[PDB]
Amino acid sequence: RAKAKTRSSRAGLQFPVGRVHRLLRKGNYSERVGAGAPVYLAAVLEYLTAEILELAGNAARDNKKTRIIPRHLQLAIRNDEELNKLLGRVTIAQGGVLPNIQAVLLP
């Protein structure tokens, strides 16, 4: 037969399409799973991951650091209104908070 070509490579993705497919089929979501659903889902996940990682890397570079930490992830998420809305009810371990002091309290 022909050499095995991964569906991720066929779709130009880094995320595992086959794994996403298995998780959908065995996750008690529906009776059947279309062929395009894992591809679409993987692409969406990849996009979101790329966005967060890029913003966290920028925060790290601004902090003269070369490794991303929970602090950097928290900064990236909380400084973007849309990401904050998406992850509103989520607590990032070891993330801390944004420096914010009410103006009325300042000397």
Binding site for DNA (CB under 7 A): 1-8, 16-19, 21-22, 25, 31-36, 65-67, 107
CB contact set of 66 (below 8 Å; sequence gap of 6+):
60
Question: How does DSSP classify residue 43?
Answer: H
Closest C-alpha among 81, 73, 13, 20 to residue 43: 13
29 binds a copy of itself (CB under 8 A): yes
Furthest C-alpha separation in the chain: 77
Residue with smaller CB distance to DNA, 34 or 96: 34
32 binds a copy of itself (CB under 8 A): no
75 binds another protein (CB under 8 A): no
Q: What is the dihedral of CA 83, 84, 90, 96, to 10 degrees?
A: 110
Amino acid letter for position 76:
A
Q: How far apart are CA 55 and CA 89, in angstroms?
A: 20
Residues 6-65 contacting another protein, CB under 8 A:
7, 10-17, 19-20, 23-24, 27-34, 36-37, 39-54, 56-57, 60-61
Segment lying near a copy of itself (by CB under 8 A), choices 5-13, 22-30, 57-65, 75-83: 22-30
47 binds a copy of itself (CB under 8 A): no
**Which residues contact a copy of itself by CB under 8 A?**
28-31
